[PDB]
């Protein structure tokens, strides 16, 4: 059973370097073409490069202009990807892939590399109060946090229907912002209590904001 496990992902300062590893099992990397592929948040796939088993050649996308170095240690049955002078556009999920006939037959789970000079910060949670049809919408603005992720629940979890927790967006400040809304009947405004439970583990932030008109 072929398996590829990558590690080395994590937070890196712009200008810094990343060292990812890909532990193989169920085959010997020594006898296969190994590649590195990546995917930035919400974007398409990109080829980084490969390492040829026949003579040790390493070929990369010129785009990377000598910043990428792919290597391998047969004694550890591990392949490596090193990249220097990291920039924001290098923020991505990096995959390690095995090649058979130039198509990728096996992939690792993927390691996320985040390139940013931002500091850990818990979010501010602001209410999106009802306007005051038989349906009203209300919610929470989970603003200015870093890094991802942040979890949102309503009424400790006893409210799931009609809830939309939107994908986070990266603001020009390097911090994230996100909104969670829910549609409820207009009549319940007052009778029923709506609380959004926000949690951001990296900053130990736990906020419970009651939302009302």
């Amino acid at each position: 059973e072929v398996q590829l496990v990558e590690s080395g992902g994590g937070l890196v300062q712009p200008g810094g370097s990343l060292r990812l590893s890909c532990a193989a099992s169920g085959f010997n990397i020594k006898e296969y073409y190994m590649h590195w592929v990546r995917q930035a948040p919400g974007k398409g796939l990109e080829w980084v490069g490969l390492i040829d088993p026949e003579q040790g050649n390493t070929i990369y996308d010129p785009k990377f202009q000598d910043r990428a170095t792919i290597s391998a240690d047969n004694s550890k049955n591990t392949a490596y990807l090193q990249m220097n002078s990291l920039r924001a556009e290098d923020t991505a999920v990096y995959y390690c892939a095995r090649d058979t006939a130039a198509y990728f037959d096996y992939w690792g789970q993927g390691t996320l590399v985040t390139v940013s000079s931002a500091s850990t910060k818990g979010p501010s949670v602001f209410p999106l109060a009802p306007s005051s049809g038989g349906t009203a919408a209300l919610g929470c603005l989970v603003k200015d946090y870093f890094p991802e992720p942040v979890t949102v629940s309503w009424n400790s979890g006893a409210l799931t229907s009609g809830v939309h927790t939107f994908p986070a967006v990266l603001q020009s400040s390097g911090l994230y912002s996100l909104s969670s809304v829910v549609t409820v009947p207009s009549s319940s405004l007052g009778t029923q209590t709506y609380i959004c439970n926000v949690n951001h583990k990296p900053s130990n932030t736990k906020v419970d904001k009651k939302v009302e008109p």
């Binding site: 398409g44 796939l45 080829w47 602001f126």
Partner: protein, 213 residues
């Protein structure tokens, strides 16, 4: 580099349909073309290699055709598990490059968005910033134009949007547009509005509120 253009960027289909996705290389790639499937948060999966070969273990409803610069991926009987994103990979020249992708999503009847606007909360204004949130709830198709209007003035560069993935129950979409301003700038105008244009509505729907009052 060789430019791979996939068409269309997204396609609406129903279970049972015959679906076709094309990839066009800028120059002849000698059939050195692979096709991949990718689902949210997961690594890609090979479907077709060498332009026309069905990879091992891949459902036979997937087939590749073409040569030269024109290639097509055909899914003969669209299954629920087939809704995902598809990419072509070109290896006729180093560096290998992927198409932009084609997301195959579920077709359903036209559903007009229920629109809601939220003013900045008093607690946020106190911190010096102002976020105005416009919500487009449960709509179909995806295409929606959300324009911000401050005292009849069209906004640009100060808003960000986020869309959910198709709902598992009703197959609709939800979107949020956040207009972000400093308290200073926010206080320079009174009327705040978001105008939504979508196929499901006769003419543009406009939601607004007079600042403060």
């Amino acid at each position: 580099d060789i430019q791979m253009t996939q068409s269309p960027s997204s396609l609406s289909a129903s279970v049972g349909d015959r679906v076709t996705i094309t990839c066009r290389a800028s120059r002849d790639i000698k059939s050195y073309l692979n096709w991949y499937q990718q689902k949210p948060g997961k690594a890609p999966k090979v479907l077709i290699y060498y332009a026309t070969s069905l990879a091992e273990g891949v459902p036979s409803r997937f087939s590749g055709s073409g040569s030269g610069t024109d290639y097509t991926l055909t899914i003969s009987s669209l299954q629920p598990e087939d809704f995902a994103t598809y990419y072509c990979l070109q290896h006729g020249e180093s560096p290998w490059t992927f198409g932009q992708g084609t997301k195959v999503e579920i077709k359903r009847t036209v559903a007009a968005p229920s629109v809601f606007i939220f003013p900045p909360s008093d607690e946020q204004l106190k911190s010096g910033t102002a976020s105005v949130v416009c919500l487009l709830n449960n709509f179909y198709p995806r295409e929606a134009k959300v324009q911000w209007k401050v005292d009849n003035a069209l906004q640009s560069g100060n808003s960000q949007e986020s869309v959910t993935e198709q709902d598992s129950k009703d197959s609709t979409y939800s979107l949020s547009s956040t207009l972000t301003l400093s308290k200073a700038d926010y206080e320079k105008h009174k009327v705040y509005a978001c105008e939504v244009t979508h196929q499901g509505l006769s003419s543009p729907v406009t939601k607004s509120f007079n600042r403060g009052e």
